[PDB]
Design a protein around this nucleic acid. Structure first.
Ligand SMILES: [K+]
Ligand SMILES: [Mg+2]
Ligand SMILES: [Mg+2]
Ligand SMILES: [Mg+2]
Ligand SMILES: [Mg+2]
Ligand SMILES: [Mg+2]
Ligand SMILES: [Mg+2]
Ligand SMILES: [Mg+2]
Ligand SMILES: [Mg+2]
Ligand SMILES: [Mg+2]
Ligand SMILES: [Mg+2]
Ligand SMILES: [Mg+2]
Ligand SMILES: [Mg+2]
Lengths: 197, 172, 136, 191
RNA sequence: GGCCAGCAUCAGUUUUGGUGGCAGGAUAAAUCCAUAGGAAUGUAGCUUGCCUCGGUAAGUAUUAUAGCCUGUG
RNA sequence: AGAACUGGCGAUGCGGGAUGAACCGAACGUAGAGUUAAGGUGCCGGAAUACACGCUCAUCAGACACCACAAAAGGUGUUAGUUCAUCUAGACAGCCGGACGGUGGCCAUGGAAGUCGGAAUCCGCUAAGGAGUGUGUAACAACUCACCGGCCGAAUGAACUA
RNA sequence: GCAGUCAAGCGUUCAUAGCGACAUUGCUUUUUGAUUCUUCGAUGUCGGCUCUUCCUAUCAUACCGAAGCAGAAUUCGGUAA
RNA sequence: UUUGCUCCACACAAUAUAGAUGGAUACGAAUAAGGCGUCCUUGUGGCGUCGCUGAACCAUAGCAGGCUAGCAACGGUGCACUUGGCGGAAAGGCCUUGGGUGCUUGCUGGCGAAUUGCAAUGUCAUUUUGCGUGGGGAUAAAUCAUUUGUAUACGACUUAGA
């Protein structure tokens, strides 16, 4: 319904999230994924590290620069899942993948925009409690991503700024809800209530 | 093989000049329809007596409805089933409101825990345990304590829409 | 100097718990847990709303905060009597939950002319509210 | 089986206050304050009468109800560590070479220094965990005592001291040298 | 006259809804009503022992100041 | 590698089994509409991140016949069962007390005392104790267990099945 | 060719430190067979030299567990190419 | 540079569109827990309340939205200016000040619309580029050729030369 849908990837079950995003992309919706480092994979961290090492040992024998590239960043791991689920060798798949942006953290353009979640991909809703899971930032750091610390620092800064913004917004919302509390027994408000508003 | 109904099936071992009015054997068959009910009747009568469908006849078939479909009962169920390596007898207990629901739960449970398909299971007996403290399985007994209450932690509501705007909660 | 432990007040599956059918033939009516069959299955009765006495999967229902006193295994007449005595229907109709359900049904039942009137009245109330917010 | 409900009791003595937010437990007593994060277990705490906490697992499996009793034991250990404390007594064992155990500082970090273990020229340094107090017990020969509120830290410091003195390339049934936990009890006597 | 369409009434094929009257079964089983008999995951009452409000625990007691089960109609 | 009956491929496209002569489904003029087969319905990918009961967590998980492999033997992993036992006249586990006398039982042995062996499996005191479950000595001794008790108080043990 | 399972025995005593009969289950395709599906309008047919890479059923080196590991030496085994 | 280059505004032309058709509407964390409000003794505190989806919220009436007259209130909103601040992860945005100006459907009137003929996206968006009219601004390099040998098969590289 929006021109751009911004998904907060935190705790979003990378494969299920990639399925949702791939279908949206192919249907024609622009998707921006933020906080890719906070994405989750089901299974133990050691399981997923071993899986990525099995991925890492695959490479073109006669020239490793031709073989499958092993992107270490969480955003690029998510992008790998999503690309594997898009028909990326066609022009249609290329257009779909151009309709997508993935980020670690929440960069400036999208830090002041609304973020959504995908309930059918959310870890807390999908995984049975007690099941172990991996965090993409930790997996990526373990397999060679160099910027977990920088992203964490920038995220702490962004969260300070956003908490200040939200304190201001909550104050204003209290003001508005109070001014709406009065004029709730007025004739116009009672007609609105009769009509369902 | 589907949602079950219980049928009484009565068959005859067809009369001749020597034996008029044969001995009218009856069975309670859990089947999803009457064709299967009669098939199972003939299967078990051929396991029991020298008769077959061609040498007998189905005297009657009648669905038996639960006499009290809206009271919770504890059923003891005796079954005989074939595993991959042998045949075994088993006793289980199922809490439900009807024999058909108990038997459906039993077939699901045998499939789930022993990989015993329908063809591999014989329902030896289904009987309501009238007296609690004759319930001998803890997974049923735990539901017979006084003033039984329990929460349903970690509620997961299904979204009608792809995206949500709220970071939902699992409270209940 | 006292020990503080957060309560985490769950709604309990229990005899007398009032539930709201969310899908099925009833799909929006109130019933009462008559008793518990299994961890996922209960026997319920909705005699006032018209819900038949039935074994239902707990996934087909949502527990409400409403509870009344009901003996375990009570038949339909007893459930109706205790329901009327505890006044469950009005205690639920007074809840914000039921009022939100009713509000969404009313909004669905609005006509085009009524939606026009809704916009006009929203604009009038908005004028007054914005003026109050600027004065404050 | 998925037991409907399983619960354990946590007796709280008088001078102890137990503050439990979601699964962060804070136990306070005469000796200090211990804290534990149990967000990995999915249990439910409830205060009964200010002297009893109930910890419960609902619809829990075998492993879940086992870890329920583990949680009960961990909170009990916190309360015991803030009321009575914990002390692990270790003995130095050596056939020929006297093990020289001392307390030293390195950048202000309070290492336990072990020299001359089995004649070695290497110096084994084991850091002292915060909250763990190291005292050498006169009137007992070659005895080091590790005391503290948290059994986890005291026992792990004792185990680190024990493992730093493992014999390599020898029959350890013969070369029994080492620093071994000989006693594990409480600080306050006869409590 | 030609090209592209819209609507209505039909025809052939078909897809998807709303609603009405009947038949059968244990002339559904139930619920419900009446009646009789029971016990418990034992309601009222009573007794015994506790004590922080005032409740509790153990007995007894089969409907009472809750109910339920079974049979029959 | 060679026979029997049938059906196929060859000689045959089409939907499915990713892929493939033979498998599944179905055999084919050119089109339109509807319904299906086998196979599928997270995304690639048309089609329910459908509904329901369970089982499984794998530091090599598993994931649809032909078919692209795995076995014997094992596991207080976990689940469900079978059978036999113990148990408020007090069970299992745990801690503690006893664990004797005839008697160095008979035979041998260089020595052999419950314990390198063969044979006999007794009796009394008994709440209970094997002519001995193990450690130990050259033999002793000395510890230890069967066995019975003290404490606790409601369930518990064994062998099997899959 | 390599590896298991059982455990009568060897190991002064002691089945399983290290071995292990009578049996029995497998794996591998660096043996040799068996077959004749591809190639007879032609895939250059031994070995060595050179050079790269891969496997692990590990000889050494790293860290370890076990021993009929006192030390030394050695043996069995684990993660390991 | 046969009057070049660039920036702003305006007009006219082309040029296409991975696809606007009211608004991408900003805490963070947890989920066996939270949000909000309030209170105090400011906490892992007390009390109240909410969720059970955004089915929301905001916006939304007027020739695709004309021209006018009032009432009420000093609100809302567009615009060009203007004040100060914050924002570097890709900041390129967020907030804020004062005056001006337009609209206001908060309320009450007056006039207009037709014939696009019973529908036909019935053209209202933004992407580049070019040209013309005004106004502001700037006034170089690179390569070849020669040369060097820290380089070199040739290219390339590294040097020098008013
Ligand atoms: K040839
Ligand atoms: Mg690198
Ligand atoms: Mg027609
Ligand atoms: Mg031919
Ligand atoms: Mg064919
Ligand atoms: Mg295949
Ligand atoms: Mg699809
Ligand atoms: Mg097996
Ligand atoms: Mg001896
Ligand atoms: Mg050639
Ligand atoms: Mg060649
Ligand atoms: Mg190896
Ligand atoms: Mg050595």
């Amino acid at each position: 319904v929006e021109p751009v849908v911004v998904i907060d990837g935190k705790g979003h079950l990378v494969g299920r999230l990639a399925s949702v995003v791939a279908k949206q992309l192919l249907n024609g919706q622009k998707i921006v994924v933020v906080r890719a480092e906070e994405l989750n994979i089901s299974g133990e961290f050691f399981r997923n590290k071993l899986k990525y090492h099995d991925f890492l040992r695959k490479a073109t024998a006669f020239n490793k620069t031709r073989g499958p590239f092993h992107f270490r960043a969480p955003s690029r791991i998510f992008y790998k899942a999503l690309r594997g689920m898009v028909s990326h060798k066609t022009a249609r798949g290329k257009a779909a993948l151009e309709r997508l942006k993935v980020f670690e953290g929440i960069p400036p353009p999208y830090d002041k925009k609304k973020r959504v979640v995908v309930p059918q991909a959310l870890r807390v809703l999908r995984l049975k409690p007690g099941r172990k899971y991996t965090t993409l930032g930790k997996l990526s750091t373990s397999v060679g991503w160099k910027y977990e610390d920088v992203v964490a620092k920038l995220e702490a800064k962004r969260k300070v700024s956003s908490a200040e913004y939200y304190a201001k917004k909550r104050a204003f919302t209290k003001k508005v809800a109070s001014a709406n509390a009065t004029a709730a027994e007025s004739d116009v408000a009672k007609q609105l209530a009769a009509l369902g508003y | 093989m589907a949602h079950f109904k219980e049928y009484q099936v009565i068959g005859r071992r067809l009369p001749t000049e020597s034996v008029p009015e044969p001995k009218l054997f009856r069975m309670r068959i859990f089947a999803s329809n009457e064709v299967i009910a009669k098939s199972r009747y003939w299967y078990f009568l051929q396991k029991l007596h020298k008769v077959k469908k061609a040498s007998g006849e189905i005297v009657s078939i009648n669905q038996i409805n639960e006499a009290h479909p809206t009271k919770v009962k504890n059923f003891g169920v005796w079954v005989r089933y074939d595993s991959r390596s042998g045949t075994h007898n088993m006793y289980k207990e199922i809490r439900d409101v009807s024999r058909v629901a108990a038997v459906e739960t039993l077939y699901q449970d045998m499939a789930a825990r022993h990989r015993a398909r329908f063809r591999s299971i014989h329902i030896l007996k289904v009987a309501e345990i009238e007296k609690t403290a004759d319930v001998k399985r803890q997974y049923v007994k735990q539901f017979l304590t006084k003033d039984l209450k329990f929460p349903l932690p970690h509620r997961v509501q299904k979204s009608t829409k792809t995206f949500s705007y709220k970071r939902p909660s699992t409270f209940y | 100097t006292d020990s503080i432990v957060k309560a985490s007040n769950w709604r309990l599956v229990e005899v007398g718990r009032v539930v709201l059918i969310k899908k099925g033939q009833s799909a929006g009516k109130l019933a009462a847990i008559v008793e518990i069959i299994d961890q996922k299955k209960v026997l319920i009765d909705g005699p006032k709303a018209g819900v038949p006495r039935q074994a239902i999967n707990l996934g087909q229902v949502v527990l409400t905060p409403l509870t009344f006193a009901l003996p375990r295994g009570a038949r339909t007449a007893t459930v109706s009597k205790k329901w009327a005595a505890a006044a469950v229907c009005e205690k639920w109709a007074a809840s914000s939950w039921a009022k939100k359900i009713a509000q969404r049904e009313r909004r669905a039942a609005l006509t085009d002319f009524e939606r026009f009137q809704v916009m006009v009245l929203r604009k009038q109330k908005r004028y007054t509210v914005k003026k109050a917010l600027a004065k404050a | 089986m998925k037991y409907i409900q399983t619960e354990q009791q946590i007796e709280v003595p008088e001078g102890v206050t137990v503050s439990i937010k979601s699964r962060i437990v804070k136990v306070v007593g005469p000796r200090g304050t211990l804290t534990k994060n149990l967000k990995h277990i999915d249990v439910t705490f409830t205060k009964v009468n200010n002297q009893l906490i109930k910890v419960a697992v609902h619809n829990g499996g075998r492993k879940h109800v086992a870890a329920l009793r583990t949680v009960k034991s961990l909170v009990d250990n916190m309360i015991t560590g803030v009321t009575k404390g914990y002390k692990y007594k270790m003995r130095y064992v050596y056939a020929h070479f006297p093990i020289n155990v001392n307390i030293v500082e390195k950048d202000g970090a309070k290492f336990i220094e072990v020299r001359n273990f089995l004649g070695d020229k290497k110096i084994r340094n084991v850091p002292v965990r915060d909250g763990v107090t190291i005292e050498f017990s006169t009137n007992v020969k070659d005895e080091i005592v590790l005391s503290g509120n948290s059994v986890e830290d005291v026992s792990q410091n004792a185990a680190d001291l024990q493992q730093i003195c493992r014999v390599r390339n020898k029959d350890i049934r013969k070369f029994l040298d080492g620093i071994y936990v000989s006693h594990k009890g409480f600080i306050t006597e006869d409590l």
